[model samples]
Target chain A: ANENNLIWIDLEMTGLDPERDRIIEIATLVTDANLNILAEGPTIAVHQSDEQLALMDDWNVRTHTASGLVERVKASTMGDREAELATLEFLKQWVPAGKSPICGNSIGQDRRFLFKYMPELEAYFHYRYLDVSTLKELARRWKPEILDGFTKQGTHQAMDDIRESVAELAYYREHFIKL
Target chain B: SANENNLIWIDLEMTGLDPERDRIIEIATLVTDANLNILAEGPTIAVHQSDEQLALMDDWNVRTHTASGLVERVKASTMGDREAELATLEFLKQWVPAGKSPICGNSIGQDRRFLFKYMPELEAYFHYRYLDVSTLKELARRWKPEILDGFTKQGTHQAMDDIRESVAELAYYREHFIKL
Candidate 1:
């Protein structure tokens, strides 16, 4: 039923609406068909304009303000477009041709933000995705340990969210090894 | 839809989806006081965006929204979207006691976007927090999924109908999820 490799992606944006919002940070993890992690990293998008920064919500500001995102974004090495290009390049190595579904807690939301900036990656990603929220909700009933991912600390960054999802995948792969 | 009396539920019909590109065609607000009593309210359909602009839009509910008819109303009247924006700000000024009051709706940001874009003064007119029924609806699905299953049946694309749906969903979630 599921043949494609899974790449867990997460995006923290200025706001929820892709139509109006801007992507602030992005993170992704590549996993094989068996859900084994291959690559993991985070991309911090450049912040500009008092207006765009003003448009950002308090949660994003609070989360990334003190984190490494501020300095990384300031280096002018990457903006949203740069982040998407680099991420698409990184992902292309693993997802060279056929489509793969981006998996994560908010991968559906993540895809919207991702494709908004990186429309070229559209073909590489499956139309449908693996939403970890739904998966975690279902998985927790069988494995109470799934709840532990909720409190795992130090994650306001994209890669951490990706890593957390990868951890949950590992748990699922181990628990349902036969299934 | 808003609860707790001080909440004011506002809904707007727009010419297009993008806030930057679009104009607010109509405005409907339910202003409630501290005890949740309806103080005063306004539902306005303006003749804004010029003739070609409103004509580009589609039909509103025949049963409720004057949709195309609104175009005629705004056309016949000497008003524009700017007039409606001013009127909305004026109506809100009367009810909001202090600070910025919360504007509630199904998609609250759309209205907020229009408000802030058109009337920059309204950015402060509203509190930093927005009351979104969609958020509450999501909460119900997570906490009480069954209650949300059959809550909404058939619905049309009208300002009032949309607001009512938000209100109904909020009420349903509150009734089932909130324990006394």
Candidate 2:
């Protein structure tokens, strides 16, 4: 019913637990309600030492290593709060206060991490969110034949994941809903 | 996340659990405060489905619906799917204060999946941080089964009563098991 913009965000963290793990990279896109991209922020990495990486699970270590996120995070000069501040500045330009809902695939997990590490940016958005995973699960129920064996490319990069989520939702809107 | 103090308790009696193959026959919603006090009682509507569609239901569903008189009520109801959805949304807007409330119920993810397909507007109204009481029940089963020793479920499967049971179950867990 509301036609405000959506703040699509994806984060590559050292692990899933918000309390213990650290966020390694963040990528964001501001899109209209219809999924038109208004802005795509730079994929920003926060510096994390090899020692911190050692504390993460083997799956993240292997995947981030293969994705080159480990290298970028290790070499990045920006601190955690510094990168968070930069992202907040980018959000201010596109998102109206408390209007745009954050969106992504299984975005609740990303939100948990954001609440832990980027509380200021987290507070800027609305309480509601658009989770592509929830829609995807519904699709599995309503139209299984359409997305049977549907797969994500799973690039393991923050920007790529955000792009995938946006595209996926657009496809769902076209197929599932009728105006 | 949403306002932690409010929750939307919902239940739907469907043709079956699988949304891919079934349809919602009835639905009820209630808004509760952080303490699980019912602030507003929303709506209970019997959604109409064609006999052809209802025929797809499995044997268990057919028996339960007949025994509960839900199949007859569904057949007699004038409200179609869209009408039921609009009514539910209107109730939510009036009862739910501020931005959004987390949907809470036992095995609520299944109820939400049905909403995602049939009542998408209603589904989108709530926050994504759903508080499923079954998660706590599962945790209790694994780590603290002794805590659930005297508990009993009514298992009526009717929408309003189901919500009452789920809310009571959650309140029970909050009182007996969880510290915070």
Candidate 3:
């Protein structure tokens, strides 16, 4: 059980389409063997691509509360290369080198997105992925259908989803998923 | 201003749904102010008779603590009837002057079932009826999927754990849903 090895990463992106959208901000917490917070911080990446900038809509801005594409572009480091390099450097330094796995609610999507930007991380990012969403599906079989009432509201944004994911993980860990 | 006084957060665990057949396993209560600060935290009560049944259910044991072990610890020093009834009545009193402040829980249906059975008079305590944190969670979900992820990922069997998750949900709702 790599209990202490898991780190929860949350991304605030420009949009949902990973192929098109760029990562705007990233927040992550590194947990010890007991899931205690060892370190935590946010990384802001600037996206200056005009093509990426063109994709920003009212919904994206409203979701992120970004001022505007021009403003975000001005605020961010333009071009995917620099942002990707900085993020990879941060991940290399922040994430410890060991068997500890990096976890996210839907880590597959985030992993794919990050790998696209920083292919150099292909070696370091190979740790097993723990998807809280997958665990939730497992929990649904044993648990009561108490969550049905809340199903209709919305989809992914980032921090909100991560917090919810953390909650679900906490529940599953405490209840069904034994160490 | 919202009627903060009427908020009653409750939780329950049962052997099964039939009040006559299934037994109450665990119960917890938290009374909060309009601002949602805990004014009172009730004692956790675990019933003694349901241990054997809980032992047989492997899935339930894995999801929650062993029922027999819980019952043993609780039996050694459980809340007396006077204290239990007093605490229940005090919570009920808060709802009377205003209306039933929206009773919030992860799932209002399950929690309400326990509350209705345990304190019949509590039904009169709230005017607005019960509210599920799941609904507030949906509104929060517009921005993120994981807000509902914790409960969905983890089973909702333990009392305090569910309450803790619900507390997080309420905070998320206050921060995001109210503004939007």
Candidate 4:
């Protein structure tokens, strides 16, 4: 059977600290066999509720560009559930069947938050993981001289990190992986 | 003075659609008034040679109005260099008199390209720098009844036809839409 394999994933929250922060925005890009971008799903902005907002700390605001504890409480009083529903509907279209591999920059942390809220989606999420960070480390260990400096530095930007990690994985497979 | 003053709608045929890869194949323009009534329509001007046109023409130019199979017939067909130059200068002199109210459009990217390429001297006159029609269309789509009606009526694509629909849509938007 022809494999129309898709990677349906989400980047939860903003900022470097995955332990505390929550996903404020989500984006999904679909690629063809050649890895050319076929289509891009619409970005969804999930505003936290007043109760959820109260829990956000000063560090969350500074790093996430979100308002601080007090400000978020006031602004999020009228939470947009309609927008959230629209985002979920948009995401449901791209999701593949039978435990599709949904990869992210740091799947261990981000995936936890996604599973916490939507327990129903746990079955769809395949346990198979692809860690870009570990892949980059392996490349650096093997070919220390040839590796680019930027890949080593590791910018925590969600999209940039994902792209770099994907590239690193491809590079390792081509050069280091044995047939 | 009022009748003579008109807007020039310029179109360029390029060697390729990709800006990085293509060279100019042909260029032409139609002069119109504020009401969009045509004042003068020039013949399609070809710029490349016969040998060049035969070699260059390919699947790339199916939709283009100008250019022969391999070379452009610009010099032989339309206004020669001197006449073309004079026509452009005359249009600029009348349309952009000293301290006149600026022409507006939805984003001046295409208009700016024409001015820079052909009428480089009229660069200073290409003001009203930030008018964007697409933004206006979005606003109209969101709020105005007539605009929404127009969208349902006509739909999109086909440039000149869309412009006609857009002008009506813009009028409806001006009446109903408000920016935050």
Candidate 5:
């Protein structure tokens, strides 16, 4: 929490527009400053409205085919208000007290989703944030091919995306200097 | 040499990101010719915000600090809005060719936005040609990434520093990315 704390998180939602769309799934993985894994998930979230569900289609998501995402959520735990609150409680346990930057690719939207579901979650984080996947030094260290091994993991899952993000965060911990 | 440049490098620092919520406090401009000659360079402070207006200001992250410093400087110097615009208008007429020159800035659109609201006549001179440094970085990031290795990321929050880099970035991309 002092030097390095990372909460690698991802949100699987009905669509990109936070106002109209809803968060169908959520996942998080906590790591140290060096990005050593500390705690992670039972990746959980609630169901979507019929209109929101229909958007899980070819027109909406790039990876999760409409039926595919719906079936996966259907198969996983059925989340409601109580379940969403538990997930909020779970995140509060790992989110740091100080300058610990939350690591994510599209975290701003994730923040919006958290606010949509759990309004108080926004104030819990530091003003500063970082995108591990976009760091220049990290990109340079990995060359064009090593990362090529992890191409989408050929599956659509929140934990898988969280895992990849954490891996990238670990790569960032090693090379902290900016160009 | 780059200051006399006709290809003007314009940069602005405002109180906040939202043009509706904030106003420009400082404007730094550099005029250079086609071959990169500095024709003129000036950094000037702008309008003093009212207490009501200043209360709404966000300071804009690290910009909050430097931007306030600029607001204070502009207030101390008593640079009125019309005074700054007329000065800016004069500078623009000198460099905008008979029409407009190919414009360039870190976020030329934002600078252009401020010009419209505060320096409308100066903004009136710009035609279509423009270089948004942020957009250029995207291409540099994709094609010739080494060209992007040295540009500032957090930004200095100084209009002059920003315009100087905007000038360098536009020049760098043109030389390396453009065949001509």
Candidate 6:
């Protein structure tokens, strides 16, 4: 267990419900505890058939389509199992067993999706998580001034979202969290 | 710094998992150390729910809550949703102090999401971090089955019972697996 690294993941899903929704795209990055980027994993657009894409609600259809994720999924040939294996192998390369906690914004939803769709990969990591959304909420209350000038790119793409999460944590580390 | 070795264990009984569609019907809390030593056994609050809210429950929650008597308790409760949430906030503030303790429970993010929506003040009372005992159990089941071989939950579905079971499960994990 390497105490110095954190596994950051962001998934673009058709909807919030892990059971009903499908993950359209995923990005993984490894960062040191200080938030330095260590490695970046493949950003994969998982293949979804027409019938699967049809299940997305109107909002997701518009949101993902606008981001070109829908087109990417349509063009991609990678299956869910294949994407899971690739992500798992990448994680194994950088993260030691049970060391790195999954870190991201609103990570619980992504984690639920992982448990359902990629159980083996989910099982490989530590049980704990480092959710930036939780920190964002705390910052709003304890130190609103630190967040007043902060801005996110608000890009829904997986890799972009991961970058935003890392940036937000870096901001908190600099001004809010006391070492 | 106050968060060290301090945990706020909670279980919220909801009509369903979705915070948007469902409502919290009951809640129970326990304050403990990192080793799962109970320091404070807090309230088991029953929140009143209207018939419309109960109607939104799926058949499984309907049947489960009915069997656990949570539906009747919610129906009979004098406390409104906000009142129950504020009561929880006071309890946490008293015990955890300065939002230092991380919430702990099984798959607790669902509970946290609901709190964020309905009880934002109460949600803000705890540390940003949480410890999901269910995730630890999942990891244990996959990598070290024997650690959880004899563990069994009461499966009552009641909030207090569920919180205690969560704490006990983590204790078992600490004893046999993590040892931390």
The candidates' DockQ values read: 0.08, 0.03, 0.01, 0.02, 0.02, 0.06
Instruction: Quote the positional error of residue B144 for candidate 5 in Å.
Output: 28
Residues A1-179, candidate 5: write the lDDT tens digits: 33345556677777755557777777777776555788875577466656667666565465565326666655655654655666557666766554444456535456556655655444555544454433321233224434443344535467777888776544433343222
As for TM-score, the candidate ahead, 2 or 4, is 2
Note the residue pairs that clash in candidate 2: A141-B20
Error of 6 at B8 (Å): 12
Q: What is the alpha-carbon RMSD of candidate 5 to the true structure?
A: 10.4
Of the two candidates 5 and 6, the one with more favorable lDDT, higher being better, is 6
Candidate lDDT values, in order:
0.59, 0.75, 0.52, 0.43, 0.59, 0.77
lDDT of each residue in A1-179, candidate 2, tens digit only: 13366788999999966667999999998887567888897689878888988898889989898999888988999867888889888887887768765677766667777877887878877766556664454344345665744568877799989988888866755664332
Q: What does the TM-score come to for chain B in model 2?
A: 0.92
Top-DockQ structure, candidate number = 1
Provide backbone clash counts, one per model. Answer: 3, 1, 16, 14, 19, 0
Model 3 error, position A59 (Å): 3.8
Candidate 1's TM-score reads 0.57
Model 2: per-residue Cα lDDT over B55-107, one tens digit each: 98889888877887889989999998789999988888776753367666765
- Stretches off by above 4 angstroms in model 4 are A1-3, A14-21, A50-59, A66-88, A91-95, A146-168, A171-179, B1-180
Candidate 3 chain B lDDT trough over 10 residues, lowest sum: B135-144
Worst lDDT run of 10 residues, candidate 3 chain A, spans A146-155
Cα lDDT tens digits, model 4, B58-125, are 66463343323324354354453345445545655654453232333332233344444444454344
Ranking 3 against 6 by lDDT, winner? 6
True contacts kept of each: 0.00, 0.00, 0.00, 0.00, 0.00, 0.02
Q: What 10-residue stretch in candidate 5 chain A is worst by lDDT?
A: A133-142
Candidate 6, residues B83-180, lDDT tens digits: the string is: 99888877876767757767778767778878877787877877766666664454444345676667988777899999999888866755565421
Kindly list the per-residue Cα lDDT of model 1 for residues A1-179, writing each as its tens digit: 13345667777676767678877777777877555787775455555555776766777677767676655555556766677677777886676544665566634455556656766655566644454443343333334564664555555677777787777655644442222
**Model 4, A1-179: lDDT tens per residue?**
11344453455354434345555655555543333444555444556655654565766555445223234324443223443455456545655544345444434445555544443443455544433333333334334554564443333334444554455544544554332
RMSD of model 4 against the true structure: 22.1
- Chain B TM-score of every predicted model: 0.76, 0.92, 0.67, 0.50, 0.80, 0.93
TM-score of 2: 0.52
